[PDB]
Design a protein around this ligand. Sequence first.
Ligand SMILES: [Cl-]
Lengths: 138, 138, 139, 138
Amino acid sequence: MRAYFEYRHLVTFADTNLVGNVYFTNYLSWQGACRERFLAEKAPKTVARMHDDLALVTSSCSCEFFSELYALDTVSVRMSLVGIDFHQITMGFEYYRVTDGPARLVARGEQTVACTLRGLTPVEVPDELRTALDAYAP
Amino acid sequence: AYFEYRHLVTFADTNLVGNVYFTNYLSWQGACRERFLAEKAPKTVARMHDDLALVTSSCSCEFFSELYALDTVSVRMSLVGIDFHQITMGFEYYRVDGPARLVARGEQTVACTLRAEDGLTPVEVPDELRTALDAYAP
Amino acid sequence: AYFEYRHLVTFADTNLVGNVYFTNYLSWQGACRERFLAEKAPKTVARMHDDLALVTSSCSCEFFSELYALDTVSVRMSLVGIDFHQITMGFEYYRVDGPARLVARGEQTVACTLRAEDGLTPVEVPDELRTALDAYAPD
Amino acid sequence: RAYFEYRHLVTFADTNLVGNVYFTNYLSWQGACRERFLAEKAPKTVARMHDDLALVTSSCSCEFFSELYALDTVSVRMSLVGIDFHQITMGFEYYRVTDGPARLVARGEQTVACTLRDGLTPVEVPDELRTALDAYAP
Ligand SMILES: [Cl-]
């Protein structure tokens, strides 16, 4: 089983603010880009269910910032499976600065998504998505 | 004769250079036009959850002087014209204290279509939306 | 005892699911904390162009209910505590017709620092910013 | 080739309640593309920006032909339209390349001015930036 799923992003000017570093919200956006790239590549049919009856909703998210990223930096975001609780999936995120080559931890994050049906009713994690997560056991 | 959208420029609007990143000016067009829809055309809005689709045909903006963090910008929207199913809106951006100072100028066009299974077929501007826009006609 | 930031939810705030994308909740914290600086701490703001830097050390948000397009959200900020150089802010998100409805709840921590020689350097919260946050502290 | 390419996977944050990509994102991609270009083709020019050189966006625009959707892959193709002493005009073509075949979905354009950083003074486009731009001339 693979330990992680890697997402890479080149930091551009819009990611930064007047202070000179990457604005904190962008770290959360990278969690979104990462988790949804995983869905596109590892569980395509699950996405089709979302336009129907399936509803994947973020229940919580968080991020801790150790060091700063700058413009034209390359960030490597590694997502790992923390655990599954019936309908809830918890992910872990590790942010690395890999601009000069060697990776250096600049931030650590975590978020939880819930699988529901269109009010909203908790439903067990779809088998396709469930099989995809099996290769990323902690 | 204009519909105003006021916005306090915060750090996220800025970049490492110090000024407001140019894409935010287009974002303010969206916030303005949709705040307009919420206040002036509720029936048109409620209809969008059904068979009505508003698609942006084109957009543009011209920049004269820069906005900075914690500045207050007055986005002022006016009706440029209506061509059957297409609505063209004009935007003027004002740095507002003292007298208001023009810092930018923009424009975008929105088309009204019927969301059908075959595709998006152009429908004339809804009566509610047209009369509401005429209040800001030249 | 809270500082309010009101926001009209527009189409850009939503995604294909129909609700507000979760990152926007964090954006509203930034918009709220910086509106606070502009209105309650001008001396601290101008000092940031000098040798003062406010770095975000952590943030989080819990989501109870969904916000939709053209909803009005009341982002209410209060002081949780201060530890030397770090400020922890609490956030409550309310859906505002009728009575206000809590839809989310978050928190973030900001550290004050010097732009000195070896980069960032921990600094006790400026007196201007310290007394400004007191008005929104549980007291 | 005849264009500098910026490839982007459309994720959920790019979309709105309708299901298509919100129009402002097309402009965001112009910024990401131009700044990725600068990082790879004009590193010394980038270095000048932290000193006295300032590239100011004077205008931008985009024309939308057909919609992009979630998990689409878009190919943003930037070419040189013209250089007027200190002003650079870039052209952008947006292609859906999801399933493989490329289809034009949008076309944009923006102009940047090379100035010096009181007051702004026009300065001729740096030779490094100029010769790098010539590779994508019409
Ligand atoms: Cl569009």
